[PDB]
Amino acid sequence: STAELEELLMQRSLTDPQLQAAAAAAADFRILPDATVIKIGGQSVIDRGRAAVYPLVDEIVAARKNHKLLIGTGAGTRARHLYSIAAGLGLPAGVLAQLGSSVADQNAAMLGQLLAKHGIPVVGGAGLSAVPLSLAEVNAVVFSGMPPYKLWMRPAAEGVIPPYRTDAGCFLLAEQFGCKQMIFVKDEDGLYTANPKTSKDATFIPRISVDEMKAKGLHDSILEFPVLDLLQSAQHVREVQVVNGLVPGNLTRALAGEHVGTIITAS
Amino acid sequence: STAELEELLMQRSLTDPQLQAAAAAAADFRILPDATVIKIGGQSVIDRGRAAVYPLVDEIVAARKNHKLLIGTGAGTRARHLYSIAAGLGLPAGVLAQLGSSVADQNAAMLGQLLAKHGIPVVGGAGLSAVPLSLAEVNAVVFSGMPPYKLWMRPAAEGVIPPYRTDAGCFLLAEQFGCKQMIFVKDEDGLYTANPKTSKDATFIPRISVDEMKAKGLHDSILEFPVLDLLQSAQHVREVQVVNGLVPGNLTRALAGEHVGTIITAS
Amino acid sequence: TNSIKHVISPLARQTLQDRDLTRPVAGKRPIRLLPWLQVVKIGGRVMDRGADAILPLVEELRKLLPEHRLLILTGAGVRARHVFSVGLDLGLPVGSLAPLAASEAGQNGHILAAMLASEGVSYVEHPTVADQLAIHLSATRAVVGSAFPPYHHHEFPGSRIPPHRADTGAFLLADAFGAAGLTIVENVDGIYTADPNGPDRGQARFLPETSATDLAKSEGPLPVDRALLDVMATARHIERVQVVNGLVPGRLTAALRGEHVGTLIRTGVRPA
Amino acid sequence: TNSIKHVISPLARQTLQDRDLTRPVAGKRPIRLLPWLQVVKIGGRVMDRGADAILPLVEELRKLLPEHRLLILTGAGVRARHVFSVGLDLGLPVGSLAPLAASEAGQNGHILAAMLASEGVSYVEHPTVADQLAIHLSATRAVVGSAFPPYHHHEFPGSRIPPHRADTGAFLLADAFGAAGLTIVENVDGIYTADPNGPDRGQARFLPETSATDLAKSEGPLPVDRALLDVMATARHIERVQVVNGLVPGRLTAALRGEHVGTLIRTGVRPA
Amino acid sequence: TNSIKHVISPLARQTLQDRDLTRPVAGKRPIRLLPWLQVVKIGGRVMDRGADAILPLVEELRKLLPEHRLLILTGAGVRARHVFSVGLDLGLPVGSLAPLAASEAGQNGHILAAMLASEGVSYVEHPTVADQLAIHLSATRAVVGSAFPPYHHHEFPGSRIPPHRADTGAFLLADAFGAAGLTIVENVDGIYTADPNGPDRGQARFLPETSATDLAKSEGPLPVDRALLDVMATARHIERVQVVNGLVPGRLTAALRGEHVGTLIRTGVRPA
Amino acid sequence: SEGPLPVDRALLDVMATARHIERVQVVNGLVPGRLTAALRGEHVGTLIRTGVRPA
Ligand SMILES: Nc1ncnc2c1ncn2[C@@H]1O[C@H](COP(=O)(O)OP(=O)(O)OP(=O)(O)O)[C@@H](O)[C@H]1O
Ligand SMILES: Nc1ncnc2c1ncn2[C@@H]1O[C@H](COP(=O)(O)OP(=O)(O)OP(=O)(O)O)[C@@H](O)[C@H]1O
Numbered sequence A, B: 001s002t003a004e005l006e007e008l009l010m011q012r013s014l015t016d017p018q019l020q021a022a023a024a025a026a027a028d029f030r031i032l033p034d035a036t037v038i039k040i041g042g043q044s045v046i047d048r049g050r051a052a053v054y055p056l057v058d059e060i061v062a063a064r065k066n067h068k069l070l071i072g073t074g075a076g077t078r079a080r081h082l083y084s085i086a087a088g089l090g091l092p093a094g095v096l097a098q099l100g101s102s103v104a105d106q107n108a109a110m111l112g113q114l115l116a117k118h119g120i121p122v123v124g125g126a127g128l129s130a131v132p133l134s135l136a137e138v139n140a141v142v143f144s145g146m147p148p149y150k151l152w153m154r155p156a157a158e159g160v161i162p163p164y165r166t167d168a169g170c171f172l173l174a175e176q177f178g179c180k181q182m183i184f185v186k187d188e189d190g191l192y193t194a195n196p197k198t199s200k201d202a203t204f205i206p207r208i209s210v211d212e213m214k215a216k217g218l219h220d221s222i223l224e225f226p227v228l229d230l231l232q233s234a235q236h237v238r239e240v241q242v243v244n245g246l247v248p249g250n251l252t253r254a255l256a257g258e259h260v261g262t263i264i265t266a267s
Numbered sequence C, D, E: 001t002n003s004i005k006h007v008i009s010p011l012a013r014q015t016l017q018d019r020d021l022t023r024p025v026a027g028k029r030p031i032r033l034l035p036w037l038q039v040v041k042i043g044g045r046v047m048d049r050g051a052d053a054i055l056p057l058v059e060e061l062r063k064l065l066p067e068h069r070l071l072i073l074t075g076a077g078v079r080a081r082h083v084f085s086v087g088l089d090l091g092l093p094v095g096s097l098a099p100l101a102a103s104e105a106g107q108n109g110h111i112l113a114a115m116l117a118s119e120g121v122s123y124v125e126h127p128t129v130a131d132q133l134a135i136h137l138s139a140t141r142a143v144v145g146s147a148f149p150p151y152h153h154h155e156f157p158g159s160r161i162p163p164h165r166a167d168t169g170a171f172l173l174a175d176a177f178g179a180a181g182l183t184i185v186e187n188v189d190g191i192y193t194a195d196p197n198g199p200d201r202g203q204a205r206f207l208p209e210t211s212a213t214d215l216a217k218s219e220g221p222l223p224v225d226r227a228l229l230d231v232m233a234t235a236r237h238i239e240r241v242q243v244v245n246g247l248v249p250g251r252l253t254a255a256l257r258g259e260h261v262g263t264l265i266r267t268g269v270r271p272a
Numbered sequence F: 001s002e003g004p005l006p007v008d009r010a011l012l013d014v015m016a017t018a019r020h021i022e023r024v025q026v027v028n029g030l031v032p033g034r035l036t037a038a039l040r041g042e043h044v045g046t047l048i049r050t051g052v053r054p055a
């Protein structure tokens, strides 16, 4: 039935719904179906320094023996400083994105300097860094977390803060390359009803869907909300897991599919 | 005798024949003598899509276990569209080359996304990618096929069509790196007397030399004719083979040295 | 012990998800970096026509340079449709197709620039547009670029077709730079109720003016991306966008002067 | 089933090898992109002499900028000979040597540009020349570059010496851009029947004018590549090339004005 | 047999370590490439202050452009301190921290340029500063850049803190280019005997003028790197450097005109 | 018509015989941004169409 698709693609506009429906009926190809994507928070983990990074380096060097790992980094508080500065000047979201990408790239460099003796490199193009993943003595890579939307970033309804950041930069990379698992390593056991660092009455949440997550009308979340709309619209990755990297083993248990922290499902 | 060569190089001009004769008497070093170069047609194969590409991907992941593979991509019909456009404007060959190089780079990416799970990467650096061609679990790479003449292309006697394209890029990459054999995967069993797609009286040709090929006064060929003048002038690669990639097994047999399709010898 | 090392700032200890905490810092309306800029997005269906459509367009542009400071962004056209057909036969995801089309856009741009080099025009890749557009425009008058945004291997899912295409990227630039105007050049007089080159060509009626909402609520096709209508709602500076036919001489020149020669699309921006 | 997905075009279903099918589309003469450009290829044997030859040359160029829009392409010289000697001792092929020499050319260019930076001159690299040149010449007056064309591992075989050197690349640009003129600067008054710095220097006779064919059908050394004579037959715009001595002041300035101060080489081009 | 293949040169068969053999060739004083250039190093503590300090500075620079040809190099500031704290907790060496700070400098520069794009200003990365600064300064009037030099991973050891920071790189450029003047903008009126923001503020005496030696032989903090004082001694062109406060309007403008509004540092250069 | 105007009447008489200019916008300069907009073709004040017939 590809003839109709081909005769539509050349005639109609890509906004033609008949065309979109024909395209949705096309095949699916997972590029790294055996790979697992994880996101190391910057403000959550790396900005804590040794106590939080060395154990995770150990866990990673241990886990690459059994899993393929795509390790994305967060930006952290340097990015928040930059955002504050630039917003004080009235600069748009694209610039702020240019700026945060760099903090993420910094953190990636620091992390890859710790893993170079273990054969784990830092790579620009994570997705087609094929070699290191085909191997068992490497089986992992570190990149940024920030997406390439440097200046063409979709601005938010209100403000200049880029809504699509490291969280999205990792999730989308997972969804594209058809990875099997997506994990967010942060400074909390998972998602609560409110920021526990501010409100110690907040309640834990082991599992939830996107719709329920919105209905709760959360003022603050452990993930970027746009990631939810992205997850609801994805094809391969239909769930993500958030865990605490300060707790030893949680990451390893999660890579094995175990339910350790919070699980967020599109449906 | 190198003393004569050195005292000439610093005095005479490189057009000095005594110097050229001294240089021809120099050593010959093969950089990838155990490697094999193949050129995947774009208009012949990739532009056919799944039916022609998936089987070849299988053949390649199979063959990389016993052979060292450099897979160059062709451009296809998008390049012909571009060439038509640009010629309609009176643009020179260099521009068209810049354009088709872009079309070849895309097919390479589409192909390397299918092979990333198999550990086969895409490279601009086809022959000094030592790391991939050394590992038996990779033992292959993908690269574009168009050469870097992006604008300094030698124009043809008449017209603006670049005479040196993917075919030439792959062949020259072979001759340079001293590879052992050079194969052209296309949509025909080999070279005929005429384009079989147009003339169904065309006769097959299993083997021929360059001189005989010119004497036949072919109006159209399955290869770029300049490749012939290059082949007549090469040192390492003195013959190439053309095969049909739609027929299964033809690659695996050719790489083994068999005579599957057409063979073209300089002498 | 393992506490976080913070950099003191208004946004410290924040996730940037709570709007009530960012609004005091980032809730204000931004500024225009290049308010003196005019953006022109040429469609690929135009460039695919070849000389017949480009040469007149090239002369028009040649006559516009001394009048404006121009960023001419090209689109992909039909080659992108071919690469989509292929990638979909192969089952590739939208993020794999986006760059493949961005490239056809870039090639159209290289062409157009070659036709204008005699006048001081050249193609700049995206990085140069982002970091250094002002200096390249202080040197010369116009520069050419690609309109597809670099969502390449990170494009949004939901559709097997990249939703963020040339129109979208052109608008995102123009609204970021705070440009003076964005102008879209198509192969049709403007926007209709239906594809006039399609089956329901007889029922197609020209829309001289409309809003992004009235369209985003419809369901039929369009000569522009539907994501453009979504980013319009979140716009900050651009108030209107004109869609014009470049096959007709003089309409582009007029549109750059604010004349209503095609279709006008009002964004969600409230004027002063 | 496995049929080809074609993009409709005049060149569809073609191999581009049958000239009778491409001639209706690509069989015509091209245009000039930068017809207002003057190209000057400085030989490396000149730069190898150092200040004694460069400073006068630099002053001449300094006096030429306001008169012309210049692309100054440098050559390699003797260092390339050394790297050739080494690579040949190692047995490297010509494609391995080409870039190694292109680099010495680029370094000579960097030097020359440093000598001229005070005047707004800088070394643009090979990609910027191909694409972003018109703008770099709208900003300033002259730019420096490498004359060696990028055939580095795809260099043509047959000889252990790269046949496509500086002269060839300079000519290929100039003819592609449709430049106004190409001028070659050497350490000798022009072309002779034999190397005047060689053994048979007493029988060497100056050639004020000649054609590319007469030389190409000849045998013996030349101050210019022999591939230049082959590309000159397939030229489209450039009708003549002048070889001059840069050790002699004023000859370059005059050559840029069309004066016959050295050797004139007529190409295969037929003017109107 | 295996003898060396030498290129004939005055420096052939030399190690470049014996000064008596290089002096006849390289013992002369160099030239100025961009003697018409003015260099301005903005400190990161200034940028980190935000709009309150940048907007006035921007309006000043906006008025300096038509008066000078400016290279504005930014510093890192506090974010570099954070990344140092982290990398030191991790035990990283100085060569691993250097680039991480150079990056914060570059981001400050991108900001400042965004605030000046309307005037034709842009951010140029070091490769472009190195060989294409003249052509970017012939197009427009000012360009922004990073001051941290690319000693990234090859930074000098001895300290866990990169000694070659913004001030040092700015001076090294200016002295290489032979620039007309280097001017440093700080958050303090100039140099004192002690940190006026620190506990011994009371005993801090302003130094209107001094030498690099008087400082390098001293001990205590400084608003400028101590490696700057070492490279000053080996300077060739720059005779004095002025440190000024950019929080105070008009002082930068005056300094670019040679006024003594802050601290003057004389180098080891002897004038005519 | 009859009555005063902020512009000459000879202006109207010559408009009647114009060749190129099709419209003229009158705007208040005491109000910021209106001049800029007008130069960009916006309708911020009064538009006067001449006798010119465009194509
Ligand atoms: N509803 C919630 N449930 C759990 N944690 C929350 C919630 N709301 C806010 N948080 C807080 O958000 C923080 C994580 O967000 P943040 O973006 O600061 O870290 P990160 O995303 O890992 O770092 P980066 O943003 O640099 O990648 C956690 O420290 C957590 O305390
Ligand atoms: N004498 C001939 N013998 C065999 N095939 C021929 C001959 N003349 C023309 N052809 C045709 O040439 C085509 C191959 O050339 P073409 O360039 O179209 O494909 P390709 O070179 O594989 O693709 P690309 O040029 O994009 O790399 C074949 O489809 C074949 O039918």
Ligand SMILES: Nc1ncnc2c1ncn2[C@@H]1O[C@H](COP(=O)(O)OP(=O)(O)OP(=O)(O)O)[C@@H](O)[C@H]1O
Pocket: A012, A013, A014, C042, C043, C044, C045, C046, C074, C075, C076, C077, C165, C166, C167, C186, C187, C188, C190, C191, C192, C193, C194, C195, C196, C197, C220, C221, C222, C223, C224
């Ligand atoms: N409602 C509509 N009004 C007008 N034209 C329409 C409409 N719907 C579809 N079209 C058609 O869509 C075509 C344009 O498609 P598209 O926008 O993909 O091309 P383009 O924008 O010129 O190229 P690119 O997308 O690469 O910029 C037009 O030729 C037009 O005939």
Ligand SMILES: Nc1ncnc2c1ncn2[C@@H]1O[C@H](COP(=O)(O)OP(=O)(O)OP(=O)(O)O)[C@@H](O)[C@H]1O
Pocket: B012, B013, B014, D042, D043, D044, D045, D046, D074, D075, D076, D077, D165, D166, D167, D186, D187, D188, D190, D191, D192, D193, D194, D195, D196, D197, D221, D222, D223, D224, D225
């Ligand atoms: N027939 C000839 N007429 C004039 N000079 C000749 C001839 N044959 C050889 N030469 C010599 O060739 C030398 C130039 O060689 P060559 O062209 O390789 O150097 P170049 O062109 O200056 O440097 P580059 O090749 O790097 O541009 C001249 O010094 C000249 O003496």
Ligand SMILES: Nc1ncnc2c1ncn2[C@@H]1O[C@H](COP(=O)(O)OP(=O)(O)OP(=O)(O)O)[C@@H](O)[C@H]1O
Pocket: E042, E043, E044, E045, E046, E074, E075, E076, E077, E165, E166, E167, E186, E187, E188, E190, E191, E192, E193, E194, E195, E196, E197, E221, E222, E223, E224, E225
């Ligand atoms: N002797 C001194 N005289 C004046 N200020 C001093 C002295 N010693 C320390 N300081 C302090 O040093 C601070 C500047 O530190 P530093 O030079 O690292 O920042 P900066 O140069 O503005 O930023 P960057 O180093 O990124 O360019 C000033 O705020 C000042 O208070």
Ligand code: MOO
Pocket: A042, A043, A074, A075, A076, A077, A079, A080, A100, A165, A166, A167, C015, C016
């Ligand atoms: O700190 Mo982030 O990753 O920009 O939200």
Ligand code: MOO
Pocket: B042, B043, B074, B075, B076, B077, B079, B080, B100, B165, B166, B167, D015, D016
């Ligand atoms: O289609 Mo090509 O350009 O001959 O490889």
Ligand SMILES: [Mg+2]
Pocket: A074, A167, C015
């Ligand atoms: Mg976060």
Ligand SMILES: [Mg+2]
Pocket: C043, C186, C222, C223, C224, C225
């Ligand atoms: Mg469109």
Ligand SMILES: [Mg+2]
Pocket: B167, D015
């Ligand atoms: Mg072909």
Ligand SMILES: [Mg+2]
Pocket: D043, D167, D186, D222, D223, D224, D225
């Ligand atoms: Mg020569």
Ligand SMILES: [Mg+2]
Pocket: E015
């Ligand atoms: Mg040494």
Ligand SMILES: [Mg+2]
Pocket: E043, E186, E222, E223, E224, E225
């Ligand atoms: Mg300081």
Ligand SMILES: [Mg+2]
Pocket: F005, F006, F007, F008
């Ligand atoms: Mg009046």
